[PDB]
Design a protein around this nucleic acid. Structure first.
Ligand SMILES: [Mg+2]
Ligand SMILES: [Mg+2]
Ligand SMILES: [Mg+2]
Ligand SMILES: [Mg+2]
Ligand SMILES: [Zn+2]
Ligand SMILES: [Zn+2]
Lengths: 576, 576
RNA sequence: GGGCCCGUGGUCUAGUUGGUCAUGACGCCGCCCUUACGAGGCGGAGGUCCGGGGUUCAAGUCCCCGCGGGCCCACCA
RNA sequence: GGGCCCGUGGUCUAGUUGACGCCGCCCUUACGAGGCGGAGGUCCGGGGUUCAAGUCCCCGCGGGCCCACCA
């Protein structure tokens, strides 16, 4: 009983709405790991700060006498004075470092119900990296079994943590076994050793391998990752949740955090921040004060950056610049740049979830910029249109491109050293632009659903509304020069394009509304064209392939088929 | 009457100590342009904030009745309640926009003495960009004349503004004419139109052309540049001062500033900041309030980032990562990336001022990282060593390098995707390392000054102190694997290296001290090997080439010969 | 369906003639500046303003109707 | 000439219950980097404290920061 819906999206990640026991939050989001005995910062304020969710170690409490009781006494919220979403850890992380931990998967799994938590974790086994073969195999099974045993003894939302070591094949498997099982969240675990050793590439090989085999709808949390240096990369991998003692742990050893890396106080002459701590202090005066005060103020600051970067990321996603932000943070350190270069290698993975159009332009600002999904796509997607229509124009990013396409995303919406001069149509070809924009936007074929049409030009010279006889097939949206279908056009297309091309099939229950014009909700989608990508102009149909309406996709096809909460299409017009 | 000394340095820029009228400040540093009549934020606060210096438009004053008087009345500081360094503008900028401004170069150059300012600017003429030819020539002469007329009627420190339009040939000339003239500061002007049109390339072409022909000792200020997006770039070009109404001007139009570019309030979902305004508010909430309060808060914010980035930069310089921060900010926007790629093209300009060793390692984080000065040099500088000594090992950044060099900056102090495994010497080789580190560090030759020596190995296996018979020629400094000369060694060298190889020539006056071991001050250097680069291990000598001491250069050779304030060498041992 | 915005390629506005509002937008030719790309600078000429209807001596510009586009809230049936 | 620090490759420590060197297995395209177990050298040089010292204070020989003098 955990709700998850994709609010906005970019890259392969997304900003979502998460609901557990009435308490809502929004992802991406990081959970500050807190060890109750000795709290550097009390939930009291974390909450006051912005953290509407955190995490503690249940197992560490099960051991302590005092808390065990205070626990079963006033729940956990009350015992931490935290009125936000609280989640716990099995203590497997403790089983990784110190090895032997005393408790049964069941004992703790149960112990978590009594303490009245909001989300819990069964005792998964975090095998380390480069671990021997069988040790990964055998250990994963034990994990999978404890995951089954926990599947049916559970009553609260639970984390099904994907283990598998440095073995992408295992990761892949333990991913489908756990995706098909009935759990609410999937954290990718046993990576801290990697992160501490800045093995950002191996981490991505892992996070990718997994996000591929997991169900799109369940939240992915990267276990033990709380440094601003990874968020942008991570999030664009389709990660949504982070947890880490990083902030306090760092602060203790006198380390300062920057989205670009780590700084040793006794190496700071200035404060590369503007938060409340670096505002009223200095590296000199803060190096003066003693531990108790020094680490507290550091942790404090660390939290502020952590928080800040996260907002930074979300903002990037909201604008459609997540990749530029990764390309920027990638420069923060060699090992991470490596990783980024590697992420960009998994085209197929990223392509699937990469929006078809964004709000802000494509920016050529690195060699890597040219390997970004949205580029590769358009280069191939435009290949055919170029030959059929021809009349090419030079492009700073794609080299050559048919003028007919020259005003639609990402061709006209790109910026690079040298500038791209677009070419407005001329009455006589105004159509070929549409035909092109159509075969490009809808697929080898679409052209025909517009064969004979009329293209109006605005006071600028831009191809806008296309209509036949008296009614409009579609409109060349100003922003990105793509086509927004207008019912009549939808129909005209549906006829020219074979099924399942660009279609969404809604259950009988929903069929009524679609016809009217009301939006479609993920839950009611029986199946939809796989090649559907976010913000695609799509055809709503009934199980019998009868046009029901046209709108704007909000999820990849494969995505609507599995989401239960959230909207699938933002219906423009209804067939009735 | 204005002092300027290079505190710390990197790239081609540096953090310096600037003193005018007893009031100290530190560069890089930005001065908020303020228009008295309607002040969005009063100096009162600006100073409270961190701005120990600002600027206003004297010509704007001379026109207004009220102010002209209040001006001649209680000076300027008092009229602005500002107790920091105040500087003014001639109004030429107003001569550019609106064209015709009423006043004589003399009239206002004198009106600036009366109002009792700390720094002033004569009426230079800011020719725009791509302006006709003569219009640039003719106009620059008028500027240079006004600069002569003001050279002799001046009593207060003044800004010698380099004009010249988009003509690098004129820029370079107008730079020598004004470098040789008696002025305190040189702003590079008539660039705003460039900056507003994000022509970051053209700006570099200009800033570079000029920094080349200007005297190293006089501070360079980039007229009208106040956006975080340029600082790292600019500063690494050897700029030291900025001024801009940017913050209030943007805030007015509802634009928010981020090190990476500009954001339109009504496009913000979150606040990618941690300052005092983005902390206690939200994009939603701030969009609600009206102008009076919206603009003020934004301006306020803008100031916070501005300040922030500047610190960022200085920190960068202090650790020796200025370039990494440019490589990062370069990704902020296409046109800027271009510019950066271009700056990196002038190797000879940058190499001269490029530290011989830095505190933090070299980072391979982009294709551009491989064109950074520090690498090109090393690859060439290492060329011969590799042939002579041989026994090469592969390197992630330089491909191949002889082991004997493998522990010396920046080979062992480099980080890139794949890692470099160093090679500690073996007693029998121990020396070849030094010999190598020698010919590499000092020049084709130096090897001999160590021909027969003893290399001690630490508890690590690292070659550290080298001595012959009983005394130490030098030591293999731990952090960078370079040689720190020990007087005996210095003379050993001096003898095998022809003049002026790595020599610093001191005025008779200073010859005394040198011998003792006290540091050398720029002022008393008659001449020094040009191939001298900061943090180079050098030989101090007297006008007749007698070894007087060994130290640590702090300026490129050609730099010592010109600097009056500031120290030239950090003397280690004296010959006496 | 409920609210607000719009008639639109993108990029972007930094040495504040007091703040602010104008001084159209597009397209057409020439000189400059450019390695030509680019991006600017200067001067010429005078066409068009998605459709329909009013208002005014004057209408891209001011309401009004239509055909369109974006954001937000509501419907998870 | 003072005051502080150190005896040193870089990088780096994010689901909070001494060092360098030597051989083998695992994980790695070998690189990288790790994970496991065997082995047990030397720890700038001299003098001490100790049953025991790289480890603790003393002197030597060295590196680093800050502050002072622009003569
Ligand atoms: Mg579904
Ligand atoms: Mg001199
Ligand atoms: Mg909506
Ligand atoms: Mg000093
Ligand atoms: Zn901070
Ligand atoms: Zn802010």
């Amino acid at each position: 009983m955990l709700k998850f819906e994709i609010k906005a999206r970019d890259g392969a990640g997304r900003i979502g709405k998460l609901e557990v026991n009435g308490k809502k939050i929004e992802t991406p989001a990081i959970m500050p790991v807190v060890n109750p005995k000795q709290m550097v910062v009390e939930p009291k304020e974390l909450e006051k700060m912005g953290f509407e969710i955190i995490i503690t170690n249940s197992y560490i409490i099960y051991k302590d006498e005092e808390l065990r009781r205070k626990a079963l006494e006033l729940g956990i919220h009350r015992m931490l004075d935290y009125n936000g979403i609280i989640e716990v850890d099995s203590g497997s992380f403790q089983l990784m470092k110190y090895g032997s931990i005393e408790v049964s998967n069941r004992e703790i799994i149960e112990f978590q119900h009594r303490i009245g938590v909001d989300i819990g974790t069964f005792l998964d086994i975090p095998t380390p990296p480069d671990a021997p073969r069988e040790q990964a195999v055998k250990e994963l099974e034990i994990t999978l079994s404890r995951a089954r045993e926990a599947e049916e003894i559970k009553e609260i939302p639970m984390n099904a943590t994907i283990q598998g070591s440095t073995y992408t094949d295992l990761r892949r498997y333990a991913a489908r076994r756990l995706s098909s099982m009935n759990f609410e969240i999937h954290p990718i675990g046993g990576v801290v050793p990697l992160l501490e050793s800045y093995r950002f590439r191996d981490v991505v090989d892992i996070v990718i391998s997994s996000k591929m085999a997991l169900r799109p709808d369940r939240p992915v949390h990267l276990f033990g990752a709380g440094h601003p240096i990874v968020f942008a990369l991570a999030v664009a991998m389709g990660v949504d949740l982070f947890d880490s003692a990083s902030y306090a742990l760092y602060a203790k050893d006198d380390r300062y955090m920057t989205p670009e890396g780590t700084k040793r106080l006794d190496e700071l002459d200035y404060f590369p921040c503007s938060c409340p701590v670096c505002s009223k202090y200095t590296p000199q005066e803060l190096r003066e004060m003693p531990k108790e005060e020094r680490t507290r103020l550091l942790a404090l600051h660390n939290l502020w950056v952590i928080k800040e970067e996260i907002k930074r990321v979300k903002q990037a996603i909201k604008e459609g610049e997540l990749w530029r932000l990764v390309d920027e943070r990638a420069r923060s350190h060699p090992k991470l740049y490596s990783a980024y270069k590697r992420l960009l290698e998994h085209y197929t993975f990223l392509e699937e979830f990469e929006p078809i159009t964004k709000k802000s332009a494509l920016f050529k600002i690195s060699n890597e910029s040219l390997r970004w999904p949205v580029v590769r796509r358009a280069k191939e997607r435009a290949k055919s249109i170029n030959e059929r229509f021809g009349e090419l124009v030079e492009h700073p990013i794609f080299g050559r491109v048919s003028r007919y396409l020259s005003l639609t995303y990402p061709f006209a919406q790109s910026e690079a050293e040298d500038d791209f001069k677009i070419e407005k149509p001329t009455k006589e070809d105004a159509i070929k632009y549409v035909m092109a924009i159509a075969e490009y936007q809808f697929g080898e074929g679409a052209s025909r659903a517009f064969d004979d049409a009329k293209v109006e030009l605005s006071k600028t010279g831009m191809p806008r509304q296309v209509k036949v006889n008296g009614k409009r097939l579609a409109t060349v949206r100003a922003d990105d020069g793509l086509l927004t279908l207008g019912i009549e056009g939808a129909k005209r297309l549906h006829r020219v394009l074979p099924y399942p091309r660009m279609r969404v099939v809604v259950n009988k229950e929903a069929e009524p509304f679609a016809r009217k014009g009301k939006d479609v909700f993920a839950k009611f989608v029986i199946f939809a064209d796989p090649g559907i990508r976010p913000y695609d102009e799509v055809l709503v149909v009934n199980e019998n392939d009868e046009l029901l309406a046209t709108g704007q996709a909000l999820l990849s096809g494969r995505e609507m088929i599995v989401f239960q909460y959230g909207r699938a299409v933002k219906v423009r017009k209804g067939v009735e």
